[PDB]
PDB file of C-alpha atoms and ligand atoms in Angstrom:
ATOM      1  CA  UNK A   1     100.636 107.093 112.075  1.00  0.00           C
ATOM      2  CA  UNK A   2      97.016 107.676 113.294  1.00  0.00           C
ATOM      3  CA  UNK A   3      97.699 111.072 111.505  1.00  0.00           C
ATOM      4  CA  UNK A   4      98.186 109.687 107.933  1.00  0.00           C
ATOM      5  CA  UNK A   5      95.281 107.183 108.591  1.00  0.00           C
ATOM      6  CA  UNK A   6      92.790 109.940 109.604  1.00  0.00           C
ATOM      7  CA  UNK A   7      93.473 111.648 106.178  1.00  0.00           C
ATOM      8  CA  UNK A   8      92.842 108.338 104.282  1.00  0.00           C
ATOM      9  CA  UNK A   9      89.875 107.271 106.499  1.00  0.00           C
ATOM     10  CA  UNK A  10      88.097 110.664 105.984  1.00  0.00           C
ATOM     11  CA  UNK A  11      88.640 110.372 102.159  1.00  0.00           C
ATOM     12  CA  UNK A  12      87.322 106.748 102.296  1.00  0.00           C
ATOM     13  CA  UNK A  13      84.286 107.914 104.345  1.00  0.00           C
ATOM     14  CA  UNK A  14      83.490 110.928 102.052  1.00  0.00           C
ATOM     15  CA  UNK A  15      83.605 108.661  98.952  1.00  0.00           C
ATOM     16  CA  UNK A  16      81.589 105.879 100.689  1.00  0.00           C
ATOM     17  CA  UNK A  17      78.851 108.183 102.151  1.00  0.00           C
ATOM     18  CA  UNK A  18      78.237 109.958  98.740  1.00  0.00           C
ATOM     19  CA  UNK A  19      77.528 106.640  96.992  1.00  0.00           C
ATOM     20  CA  UNK A  20      75.839 104.861  99.966  1.00  0.00           C
ATOM     21  CA  UNK A  21      73.283 107.675 100.625  1.00  0.00           C
ATOM     22  CA  UNK A  22      72.588 108.195  96.845  1.00  0.00           C
ATOM     23  CA  UNK A  23      72.077 104.480  96.096  1.00  0.00           C
ATOM     24  CA  UNK A  24      70.071 103.539  99.258  1.00  0.00           C
ATOM     25  CA  UNK A  25      68.455 106.937 100.078  1.00  0.00           C
ATOM     26  CA  UNK A  26      69.360 106.281 103.770  1.00  0.00           C
ATOM     27  CA  UNK A  27      71.241 108.806 105.930  1.00  0.00           C
ATOM     28  CA  UNK A  28      74.716 107.815 107.275  1.00  0.00           C
ATOM     29  CA  UNK A  29      75.069 107.566 111.071  1.00  0.00           C
ATOM     30  CA  UNK A  30      77.968 109.365 112.887  1.00  0.00           C
ATOM     31  CA  UNK A  31      81.674 108.605 112.210  1.00  0.00           C
ATOM     32  CA  UNK A  32      83.719 106.929 115.005  1.00  0.00           C
ATOM     33  CA  UNK A  33      87.210 106.311 113.514  1.00  0.00           C
ATOM     34  CA  UNK A  34      88.280 104.451 116.716  1.00  0.00           C
ATOM     35  CA  UNK A  35      85.335 101.953 116.553  1.00  0.00           C
ATOM     36  CA  UNK A  36      86.149 101.436 112.808  1.00  0.00           C
ATOM     37  CA  UNK A  37      89.918 100.959 113.463  1.00  0.00           C
ATOM     38  CA  UNK A  38      88.965  97.924 115.687  1.00  0.00           C
ATOM     39  CA  UNK A  39      86.752  96.577 112.792  1.00  0.00           C
ATOM     40  CA  UNK A  40      89.643  97.156 110.320  1.00  0.00           C
ATOM     41  CA  UNK A  41      92.089  95.306 112.658  1.00  0.00           C
ATOM     42  CA  UNK A  42      89.787  92.210 112.884  1.00  0.00           C
ATOM     43  CA  UNK A  43      89.441  92.424 109.070  1.00  0.00           C
ATOM     44  CA  UNK A  44      93.123  92.580 107.959  1.00  0.00           C
ATOM     45  CA  UNK A  45      93.868  88.935 109.000  1.00  0.00           C
ATOM     46  CA  UNK A  46      90.626  87.743 107.254  1.00  0.00           C
ATOM     47  CA  UNK A  47      91.524  89.621 103.983  1.00  0.00           C
ATOM     48  CA  UNK A  48      95.066  88.065 104.034  1.00  0.00           C
ATOM     49  CA  UNK A  49      93.494  84.538 104.427  1.00  0.00           C
ATOM     50  CA  UNK A  50      90.534  85.096 101.985  1.00  0.00           C
ATOM     51  CA  UNK A  51      92.763  86.794  99.268  1.00  0.00           C
ATOM     52  CA  UNK A  52      96.555  87.225  99.935  1.00  0.00           C
ATOM     53  CA  UNK A  53      99.142  88.781 102.365  1.00  0.00           C
ATOM     54  CA  UNK A  54      99.056  92.656 102.456  1.00  0.00           C
ATOM     55  CA  UNK A  55     102.494  94.000 101.352  1.00  0.00           C
ATOM     56  CA  UNK A  56     103.171  97.633 100.283  1.00  0.00           C
ATOM     57  CA  UNK A  57     103.467  96.376  96.601  1.00  0.00           C
ATOM     58  CA  UNK A  58     100.085  94.456  96.586  1.00  0.00           C
ATOM     59  CA  UNK A  59      98.503  94.641  93.108  1.00  0.00           C
ATOM     60  CA  UNK A  60      95.330  96.632  92.273  1.00  0.00           C
ATOM     61  CA  UNK A  61      93.161  93.561  91.313  1.00  0.00           C
ATOM     62  CA  UNK A  62      94.007  91.978  94.720  1.00  0.00           C
ATOM     63  CA  UNK A  63      92.800  95.081  96.633  1.00  0.00           C
ATOM     64  CA  UNK A  64      89.715  95.226  94.341  1.00  0.00           C
ATOM     65  CA  UNK A  65      89.014  91.560  95.364  1.00  0.00           C
ATOM     66  CA  UNK A  66      89.397  92.433  99.058  1.00  0.00           C
ATOM     67  CA  UNK A  67      86.765  95.241  98.561  1.00  0.00           C
ATOM     68  CA  UNK A  68      84.164  92.392  98.090  1.00  0.00           C
ATOM     69  CA  UNK A  69      84.966  91.150 101.653  1.00  0.00           C
ATOM     70  CA  UNK A  70      84.554  94.457 103.591  1.00  0.00           C
ATOM     71  CA  UNK A  71      80.930  95.142 104.752  1.00  0.00           C
ATOM     72  CA  UNK A  72      79.799  98.743 105.412  1.00  0.00           C
ATOM     73  CA  UNK A  73      77.087  97.542 107.941  1.00  0.00           C
ATOM     74  CA  UNK A  74      80.025  96.676 110.330  1.00  0.00           C
ATOM     75  CA  UNK A  75      81.252 100.395 110.428  1.00  0.00           C
ATOM     76  CA  UNK A  76      80.109 103.407 112.588  1.00  0.00           C
ATOM     77  CA  UNK A  77      78.853 105.629 109.743  1.00  0.00           C
ATOM     78  CA  UNK A  78      76.846 102.755 108.101  1.00  0.00           C
ATOM     79  CA  UNK A  79      76.041 100.599 111.201  1.00  0.00           C
ATOM     80  CA  UNK A  80      73.439  97.936 110.119  1.00  0.00           C
ATOM     81  CA  UNK A  81      72.073 100.274 107.344  1.00  0.00           C
ATOM     82  CA  UNK A  82      72.352  97.959 104.231  1.00  0.00           C
ATOM     83  CA  UNK A  83      74.231  95.069 102.566  1.00  0.00           C
ATOM     84  CA  UNK A  84      76.714  97.286 100.696  1.00  0.00           C
ATOM     85  CA  UNK A  85      80.387  96.204 100.529  1.00  0.00           C
ATOM     86  CA  UNK A  86      83.343  98.436  99.513  1.00  0.00           C
ATOM     87  CA  UNK A  87      83.232  96.983  95.957  1.00  0.00           C
ATOM     88  CA  UNK A  88      79.536  98.070  95.715  1.00  0.00           C
ATOM     89  CA  UNK A  89      80.887 101.656  95.984  1.00  0.00           C
ATOM     90  CA  UNK A  90      83.945 101.048  93.741  1.00  0.00           C
ATOM     91  CA  UNK A  91      81.436  99.863  91.092  1.00  0.00           C
ATOM     92  CA  UNK A  92      79.519 103.238  91.188  1.00  0.00           C
ATOM     93  CA  UNK A  93      82.730 105.306  90.649  1.00  0.00           C
ATOM     94  CA  UNK A  94      84.005 106.614  87.299  1.00  0.00           C
ATOM     95  CA  UNK A  95      87.316 105.092  86.077  1.00  0.00           C
ATOM     96  CA  UNK A  96      89.349 108.065  87.419  1.00  0.00           C
ATOM     97  CA  UNK A  97      87.976 107.897  90.987  1.00  0.00           C
ATOM     98  CA  UNK A  98      88.267 104.053  90.907  1.00  0.00           C
ATOM     99  CA  UNK A  99      92.105 104.411  90.945  1.00  0.00           C
ATOM    100  CA  UNK A 100      91.924 107.003  93.790  1.00  0.00           C
ATOM    101  CA  UNK A 101      89.592 104.651  95.800  1.00  0.00           C
ATOM    102  CA  UNK A 102      91.873 101.582  95.254  1.00  0.00           C
ATOM    103  CA  UNK A 103      94.898 103.696  96.371  1.00  0.00           C
ATOM    104  CA  UNK A 104      92.973 105.054  99.413  1.00  0.00           C
ATOM    105  CA  UNK A 105      91.754 101.570 100.512  1.00  0.00           C
ATOM    106  CA  UNK A 106      95.206  99.950  99.949  1.00  0.00           C
ATOM    107  CA  UNK A 107      97.023 102.785 101.862  1.00  0.00           C
ATOM    108  CA  UNK A 108      94.392 102.616 104.662  1.00  0.00           C
ATOM    109  CA  UNK A 109      94.894  98.825 105.086  1.00  0.00           C
ATOM    110  CA  UNK A 110      98.715  99.515 105.231  1.00  0.00           C
ATOM    111  CA  UNK A 111      98.352 102.163 108.009  1.00  0.00           C
ATOM    112  CA  UNK A 112      96.072  99.642 109.865  1.00  0.00           C
ATOM    113  CA  UNK A 113      98.881  96.942 109.508  1.00  0.00           C
ATOM    114  CA  UNK A 114     101.386  99.384 111.183  1.00  0.00           C
ATOM    115  CA  UNK A 115      98.674 100.244 113.863  1.00  0.00           C
ATOM    116  CA  UNK A 116      98.351  96.458 114.735  1.00  0.00           C
ATOM    117  CA  UNK A 117     102.183  96.129 115.270  1.00  0.00           C
ATOM    118  CA  UNK A 118     102.360  99.318 117.463  1.00  0.00           C
ATOM    119  CA  UNK A 119      99.372  97.975 119.563  1.00  0.00           C
ATOM    120  CA  UNK A 120     101.199  94.619 120.272  1.00  0.00           C
ATOM    121  CA  UNK A 121     104.327  96.645 121.333  1.00  0.00           C
ATOM    122  CA  UNK A 122     102.041  98.575 123.831  1.00  0.00           C
ATOM    123  CA  UNK A 123     100.851  95.179 125.224  1.00  0.00           C
ATOM    124  CA  UNK A 124     104.464  93.803 125.340  1.00  0.00           C
ATOM    125  CA  UNK A 125     105.509  96.931 127.405  1.00  0.00           C
ATOM    126  CA  UNK A 126     102.398  96.320 129.604  1.00  0.00           C
ATOM    127  CA  UNK A 127     103.258  92.551 130.060  1.00  0.00           C
ATOM    128  CA  UNK A 128     106.948  93.526 130.789  1.00  0.00           C
ATOM    129  CA  UNK A 129     105.645  95.829 133.657  1.00  0.00           C
ATOM    130  CA  UNK A 130     102.932  93.364 134.870  1.00  0.00           C
ATOM    131  CA  UNK A 131     105.610  90.560 135.100  1.00  0.00           C
ATOM    132  CA  UNK A 132     107.720  92.909 137.359  1.00  0.00           C
ATOM    133  CA  UNK A 133     104.704  93.604 139.663  1.00  0.00           C
ATOM    134  CA  UNK A 134     103.685  89.905 140.138  1.00  0.00           C
ATOM    135  CA  UNK A 135     107.413  88.830 140.502  1.00  0.00           C
ATOM    136  CA  UNK A 136     107.094  90.465 144.019  1.00  0.00           C
ATOM    137  CA  UNK A 137     104.035  88.226 144.960  1.00  0.00           C
TER     138      UNK A 137
HETATM  139 NI1  LIG B 201      80.463 110.072  92.274  1.00  0.00          NI
END
């Protein structure tokens, strides 16, 4: 599940870096997928509120809208470098790579949705054990 995300995330980063460095002239900072997963998890709720709920059948134009609301300065590889958003990069792509980028972003937000649900199972199992420990004191 982290496995299919790391494929997507690395695609998303390769595409983003190419455009970001070309357009700004600045050098990307180092990738930390884990740091960026946290950022993505904060972001999913805010995209669902700002635009619409994220379902596996969410339409292209809805994703493309969400790309306006995702700031590269928040992520490891672009930390505080410039004001670029994901749409800023979509807009520099040719019409073929636009479809790939929409697919990659959509599929990445889906894997992040499944990562959120798994994480709140891990915390449920942890509460279930913590409740046992304190129900002796
Ligand atoms: Ni290009």
